[PDB]
Design a protein around this nucleic acid. Sequence first.
RNA 1: UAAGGUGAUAUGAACCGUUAUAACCGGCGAUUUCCGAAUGGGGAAACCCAGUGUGUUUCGACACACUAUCAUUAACUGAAUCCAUAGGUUAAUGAGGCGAACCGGGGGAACUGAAACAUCUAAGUACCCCGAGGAAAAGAAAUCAACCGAGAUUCCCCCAGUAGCGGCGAGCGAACGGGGAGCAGCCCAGAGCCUGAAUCAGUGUGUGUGUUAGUGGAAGCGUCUGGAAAGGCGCGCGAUACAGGGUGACAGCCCCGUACACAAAAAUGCACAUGCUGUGAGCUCGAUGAGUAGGGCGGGACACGUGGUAUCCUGUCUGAAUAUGGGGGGACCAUCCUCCAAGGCUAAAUACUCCUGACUGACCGAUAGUGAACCAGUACCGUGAGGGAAAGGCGAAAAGAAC
Lengths: 50, 101, 61, 46, 102, 77
Amino acid sequence: ELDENLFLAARNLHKVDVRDATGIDPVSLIAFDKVVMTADAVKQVEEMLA
Amino acid sequence: MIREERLLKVLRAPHVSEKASTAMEKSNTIVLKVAKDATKAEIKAAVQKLFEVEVEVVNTLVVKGKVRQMTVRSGGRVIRTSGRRSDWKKAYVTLKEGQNL
Amino acid sequence: KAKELREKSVEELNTELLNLLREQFNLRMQAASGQLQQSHLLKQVRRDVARVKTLLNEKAG
Amino acid sequence: MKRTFQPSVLKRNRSHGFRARMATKNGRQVLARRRAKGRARLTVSK
Amino acid sequence: AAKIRRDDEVIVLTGKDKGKRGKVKNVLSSGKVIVEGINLVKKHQKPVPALNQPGGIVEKEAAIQVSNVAIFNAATGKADRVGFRFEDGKKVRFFKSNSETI
Amino acid sequence: SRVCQVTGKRPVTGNNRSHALNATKRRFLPNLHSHRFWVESEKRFVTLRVSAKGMRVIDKKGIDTVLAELRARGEKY
RNA sequence: UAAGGUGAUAUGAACCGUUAUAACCGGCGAUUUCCGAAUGGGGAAACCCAGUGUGUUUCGACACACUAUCAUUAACUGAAUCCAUAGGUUAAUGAGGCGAACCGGGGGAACUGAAACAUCUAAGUACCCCGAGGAAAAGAAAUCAACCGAGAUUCCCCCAGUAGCGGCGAGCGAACGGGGAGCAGCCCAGAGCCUGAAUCAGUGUGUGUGUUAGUGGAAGCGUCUGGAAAGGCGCGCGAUACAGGGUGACAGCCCCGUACACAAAAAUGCACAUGCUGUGAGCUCGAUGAGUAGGGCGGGACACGUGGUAUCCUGUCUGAAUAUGGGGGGACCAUCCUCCAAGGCUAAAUACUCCUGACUGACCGAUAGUGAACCAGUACCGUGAGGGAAAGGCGAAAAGAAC
């Protein structure tokens, strides 16, 4: 779930992006050096990709 | 009965121009610039009331403005502009026997 | 300047306007004749004439 | 010899002047077109 | 809201006058300032015999950009920024880094 | 213009079609006639420019009611 | 809102101002020459000439106001002609003209294609004319369907380049049905009972929210090179602000900003809440749009070119029935299905951008991009309609070269 606090804290950082796990896109996953997923986010992407 | 304000607006400036000085010293007429819409009666009344002289007659002519051109450095570039000077009215006022200036 | 012309009546406002117009005429004569190094009273007299006429319009309406 | 432009101010104004343009709807359309183009001199009425 | 006024002791931050201090004389509408004896240039004054001394190599200070000067604290002895606050319903400038009214 | 004062009939446009079906373009004009109608109610003759269809309409409705309709539309008679 | 100003050119001169009535910015207001619908008459735009009132006068004259046409309404008076109409005069309202596209309507090409050309196409396009609005138009079934049903208009995607039309050539080209956006329906043709009875337009208040000026806004220093540092190197700090722009080379921390948080004397938009003003509700009975539907002749519109041609419109000539009646279901007839013309109104979804604000671009970068980066619809050309250019860059700073 998009935690508004984290999103606010991140959106002036430099290389850091915060997503919703329904807003992931092919280019973003390749562009950034590292991807951090919360476990529930992994579950949502699991069911979404089926 | 031309009102005071009209009179205070008609007489613009005395016109010094050699032909004016000779006219003053020979024919006892002063030469002066007047509002382009001034009529002879207006100039007569204005001169009489504002200079406290007694005038005989007024002759008027309209001088057409020349063209002068020069430059303006608006925008950094000195653009050559031309335009027309403004037309004006010249009055030859013949005083009777007085003297003002 | 408008503050203490606003509490005159209508006739001495008219006399004030006439005095201002006379001053304007003599200033014009001086400027033409080459005197009047104080070449700033012309703007002053005209702004005061404007002010007086504005007040006259205000009171007569 | 004699050329085609033989000037005359009266005929110029009576044929192409402002009031001649304004007399008919076609001349008024000419004036509207010239206003739309942004013409500095609208007619020969200078 | 100007942040530099008639006579602020300022110190130059860039431009061959770093560390030199002076007093502002003029503030130009183009966002530039003239300050005491800082940006001196050598004007080559034409003679002009019409009511003017011939004039040779005149030394006079040129305008400098307000971004290039900083108000001088004179209590900390260093350049600092200026903030705006309200006291007694009046807008006042204060030094940053010590919060003292100018 | 050629307009019936009662029915508003106008000239319309259409085609002359030949045997070879060449379409030349033409007008159909209404059957207009100027006629003097006696108005019993107000005792005078009013001249109207009406078609034959208009005259049939008048002698079905009556001249007075048709005149009322004309006044309703601002027509001048 | 302010410590600086008197626009550029602009230097200068003479000045104004420094908590507060200098300048600047916004709301409201005043002034607003002449021409131009131009409107007192005229006219070769920016000019010429008045008439009638009111007032003033120094007796020369002066100032102000009104005076166009047409439409509607009213008052007065009024010919042939008795009444009466026409006409006349004066008032009061309203219009007029301009403007880019979008919209409805009245007219309406040809080039071209058909490998020629006439039917056909191009095309109801270009163009001309009239009218309106912020949208317009359409619109509440004489509609489709198919023996089951749907339920006003409009717009999008399919159906489908199908069925058809067609010198059956070139070409034109649907509907039914389905999926969506949006979605409320109502009046008159009339009387009684209730009988302001909610409702809708106008106006007056109050609240909220915008718009028209604004306010605050966070953090960096050493050293190297260098004309200059924002760069290199080192060590720090802000970040709900690392959008962007400027600053002597490339700046989160120098400046202007940005995130964020606030702000209105006054005038206005939109919502509500009410006060008042006109309309108006609901019930019972009724009534149900005639020179009309249909027809003959000629045209036009329907995808449909007259064909076996349904339906719509009408220039011409005719001409019903009246709800036990009538229209439609693609010649026509019979059954049975469906609907009720000849009276109106009606939001949204839809079209467009002269103009205003913000933002964006695998758009151009001075022979490009607008014709016009620049004082360009200019110079210049043409009687005229009209045509129509070329022309950017000193430097960080004029320090633009005293002698």
